[PDB]
Design a protein around this ligand. Structure first.
Ligand SMILES: Nc1ncnc2c1ncn2[C@@H]1O[C@H](COP(=O)(O)OP(=O)(O)O)[C@@H](O)[C@H]1O
Ligand SMILES: Nc1ncnc2c1ncn2[C@@H]1O[C@H](COP(=O)(O)OP(=O)(O)O)[C@@H](O)[C@H]1O
Ligand SMILES: Nc1ncnc2c1ncn2[C@@H]1O[C@H](COP(=O)(O)OP(=O)(O)O)[C@@H](O)[C@H]1O
Ligand SMILES: Nc1ncnc2c1ncn2[C@@H]1O[C@H](COP(=O)(O)OP(=O)(O)O)[C@@H](O)[C@H]1O
Ligand SMILES: N[C@@H](CCC(=O)O)C(=O)O
Ligand SMILES: N[C@@H](CCC(=O)O)C(=O)O
Ligand SMILES: N[C@@H](CCC(=O)O)C(=O)O
Ligand SMILES: N[C@@H](CCC(=O)O)C(=O)O
Lengths: 294, 294, 294, 294
């Protein structure tokens, strides 16, 4: 087999290490870890070599992009050139790009029939009351975003809280913002990791006592999870819908049923690997092996 | 005929006025001018009405997006919902979005065989000298960008100037940056306006005495233009390649031949209309008439 | 008399016009309106001439700074050099600088015994409940700030609203934030204009029906005002405390008495002049005449 | 003795550790390390207790501020309240604030007779050529700043390089910018640390081969230094001029003589302590002991 695999990321942390690791072990591939910001290239004379620290990169059979949530325009541009050069990517540029846009993504999932929590979109709404009644929620979650980031979620328990929050962010200096209703659940969401056509690993993220969130560490506490065949199907469908080869789908257990809340094109590996003991980084190299062409 | 056409833009300026104007005249259409930021809607239960100042919008047969270069994530999200609701757009969401990304666009044009000036892409290159020799240029233009904007172009006449400039912007607080070679020309570029499958109008933009630029007004001076059949074909091909129904293509007259430098999905109307005396806003309403379905 | 007065501001709008106007009329002074951003100078060899569009400025007997709320670091640097060159300023650099910092200013006023509304300061408080009980308010105003700007005020009517708002902004991407209690009043505040040791003019700013604010135009409606001798004294004391020669003091009429809410070192002239019919721009030139040394 | 000393900083890193360390050792003081962002307090009813994680802070005899270069408005506001409460600060709020403003500081040093390199100040100069000839330098250093930060320095060796750089940053999206001439020296500057009325420690910072800088690590390499009595006097005078109790003065060895280039109100301790083996953190606690009042 023996591939030259590149890993597009900004440094050596567990996930990037765990595949330098699993690609050198598994069918003895060669691996170079490249900062996308240090690539530079002629986007003109179509294709052309990619340059890195004064030398020309040597042609990778595959590229594993792991692009930051703040470097996504240049990151995917570099990714694109590798694709143009022949490298197989897990998660392709177009799909990664789209994925960062939570709005376009939520829309896409919704159109494709995937059960989400009822969700409003807004920026400078002009009539907060009408916005709150739309969506329905007497208590709901407001999620600030700003461009393509996320900079806060907050629970609004009463009508007035939801009003004061929206009116606050309305001062466009916060820009785009999302409304969806809160849950039964209990600060607990299931995170599935999809690689290709299967859910490779899954954990429960539980919130702390003080309010909810649940986030990785906003007071988070991980534990191994018991996914229903229904939840497994959905998390795969979300990834398929998104055109992601590797993805983190987050699911909320509502009375009505499982609801997708978020999809990630660069899920972290540490918490989910350490929690379950599963070789995820290996299932990704294995996926590359089944699809890249040497 | 009689359509309800919406115009997605942030205010009443010549271009937005000139089509409220041309749609009310031409086959007596009804027009509402909407700020995208004031739309708010359920992106979930697939489709769902768009809300605006407390009321529900009434279904537009067509939407004319004219989205700002700084509102492009929410703008195209709102655009998308109109599309999902049945409205025909001139310039669709996906195509508009992509267009803002100058990097993805330059790449796309290049791949599709369109003659551009030789162009390097870079962010934090690590070896400026190698970057400068790549691209070739002893004198070249450095174009700062930052995310998806543009915040400066500058001519670097010597090797050292090109060095000092790159090293300056390299401090990532400027982020993504473009290198391409300077011209014969003479601070003068041809701007074509494409509507559908034809170039509807064209002007020459001439720079002032002090250095170049040429920009609309960075010292700009407009005058009617004599486009060659070759230049006309290209400006149409660029728009086709970009999937833009309406576009501003800017062309540089180089010795080698015409070179596309830029493509815009919301070209201004004033300078080009006043200069030529052509009813552009009408050719766009006319285009809508040939393609929207009532 | 005949002075050379410079006006440090970024353009010709009512206030800047109304003193080019009043300085050319009143004792026939000469006036140049300079953009601070276009000044450039040697801050070293102590003093040294200030340069502007390739020429050296000619020595102004006085400088009227009218520096933007976003240009205040360079603005006051240029201001400083004029001071170093001999020019008398109304509002000096140090005082202007300090004034932009609403936190340092509120603190200073408070220390100097000036009645303010009870006010909490916070950034990432860690225990919102304790913050809300401090300050007291069951209903209070949260005022987002971010560095030195202001980007929103909002009323929180219930405990929960005040909670959700603080928790929202707590995501430091909003940075520094202010809590103070809401009023009787009724979206109405008195704005005094101080020039030297007297209140030169005063208006009432009344809010619209929908909630409060009251702002110039956040639904604002101006009308001539009846200031009590007590309110007049305070607005003068605030300016004195702040070391401002010209200032806009905003006062809230509370049961307890008049409360300073805000102090401005570049108050607008239009609304207050048109409302009252008073020649404010002239009272400022007159002040310059009494204090600048030719 | 036994003082309660607070350390205002955002975390445990060498310098903050090395004084928790030296204050618990030296005359057995009690130390609490507080994040300024987590303080919250009533700036009104003059003074009032400072709150931290739901509890009231207990009165510190002294406060050691170590405020970030990006938190300086809120940081110094919290600092100010400690001062208002009786705590002795090394480096007081006003002096710290001013210090962040490199422009006001360079100006102040210059006015007070301290030899600096010849330095131009500019933002959007309008005539770069005149700016370059002012300052004199055929080769000079351009230092981007933006508000109050620093985001780049660069050497411009030729006239054209200096032109292209200024014209680049001129696009105000870089904001305020500094010109000063380059050196003999050789990417090497002397860094003195002043505590009170003496230079407590000093190192040489040497640049790498590729161009200059010299920065801590922009390729930096530290080594113990041999300060002349002249250089020692200056570094003390700079700190005195700046009203800093603790300061990092950086000096360039020019033919003409020693030139101050920079003054810091929160110098790092690690590089300078490890290089020289001097107990700096102790000389600061000792200073506090001589001046704080229990
Ligand atoms: N609609 C909702 N209902 C209930 N809890 C939610 C909802 N949205 C988010 N949360 C909680 O808040 C946390 C933050 O959500 P968010 O930032 O959108 O996603 P992520 O967990 O991927 O960062 C989630 O882990 C979840 O437990
Ligand atoms: N590669 C180039 N060679 C010569 N001149 C150029 C080049 N790129 C840009 N210019 C000049 O600088 C101006 C600014 O270009 P740019 O900002 O990229 O496009 P736009 O004109 O669409 O804003 C152009 O009008 C053009 O005349
Ligand atoms: N503590 C308060 N109590 C009642 N109303 C307030 C309070 N603070 C502000 N407001 C109202 O909100 C408006 C916005 O206040 P702010 O932005 O702080 O000052 P400014 O009016 O100078 O912009 C004010 O005009 C005022 O009428
Ligand atoms: N005027 C100058 N002449 C020569 N070298 C300089 C000059 N200014 C700065 N340098 C070099 O560049 C480095 C960066 O300078 P700067 O960022 O201003 O200060 P600091 O070293 O405090 O960060 C300095 O250490 C110095 O060696
Ligand atoms: N969200 C869109 C798709 C977005 C895209 O294709 O990029 C939809 O409803 O299909
Ligand atoms: N620039 C890409 C296309 C980008 C896209 O499809 O969005 C190419 O070379 O085809
Ligand atoms: N706010 C400070 C004064 C601020 C200053 O002097 O700059 C005080 O209580 O005196
Ligand atoms: N730079 C000023 C002093 C600045 C200040 O006092 O804050 C001077 O020349 O004195």
């Amino acid at each position: 087999s023996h591939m030259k695999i590149a890993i597009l990321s900004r440094d050596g942390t567990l996930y990037s290490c765990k595949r330098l690791r699993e690609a050198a072990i598994q069918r003895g591939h060669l691996v170079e870890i490249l900062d996308p910001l240090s690539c530079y290239m002629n986007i003109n004379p179509a294709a052309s070599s990619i340059h890195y620290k004064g030398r020309k990169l040597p042609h990778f059979d595959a590229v594993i992009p792991r692009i930051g949530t703040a470097i996504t325009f240049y990151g995917t541009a570099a990714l694109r050139q590798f694709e143009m050069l022949g490298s197989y990517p897990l998660n392709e540029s177009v799909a990664i790009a789209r994925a960062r846009d939570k709005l376009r993504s939520m829309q896409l999932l919704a159109r494709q029939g995937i059960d989400l929590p009822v969700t409003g979109i807004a920026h400078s709404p002009d009539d907060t009351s009408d916005l709150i009644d739309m969506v329905g929620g007497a208590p709901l979650v407001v999620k600030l975003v700003e461009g393509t980031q996320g900079i806060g979620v907050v629970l609004a328990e009463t009508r007035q809280a939801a009003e004061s929050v929206i009116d606050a962010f309305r001062g466009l200096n916060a820009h785009i913002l999302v409304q969806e209703y809160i849950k039964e659940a209990q600060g607990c969401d299931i995170r599935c990791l999809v690689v290709g056509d299967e859910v490779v690993a899954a954990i429960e993220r539980r919130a702390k006592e003080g309010d909810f969130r649940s986030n990785l560490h906003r007071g988070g506490a991980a534990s191994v999870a018991s996914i229903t065949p229904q939840e497994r199907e959905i998390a795969i469908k979300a990834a398929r819908t998104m055109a992601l080869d590797v993805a983190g789908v987050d699911i909320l257990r509502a009375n009505r049923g499982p609801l997708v809340m978020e999809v990630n094109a660069s899920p972290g590996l540490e918490g989910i690997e350490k929690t379950t003991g599963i070789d995820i980084a290996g299932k990704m190299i294995r996926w590359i092996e089944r699809h890249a062409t040497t």
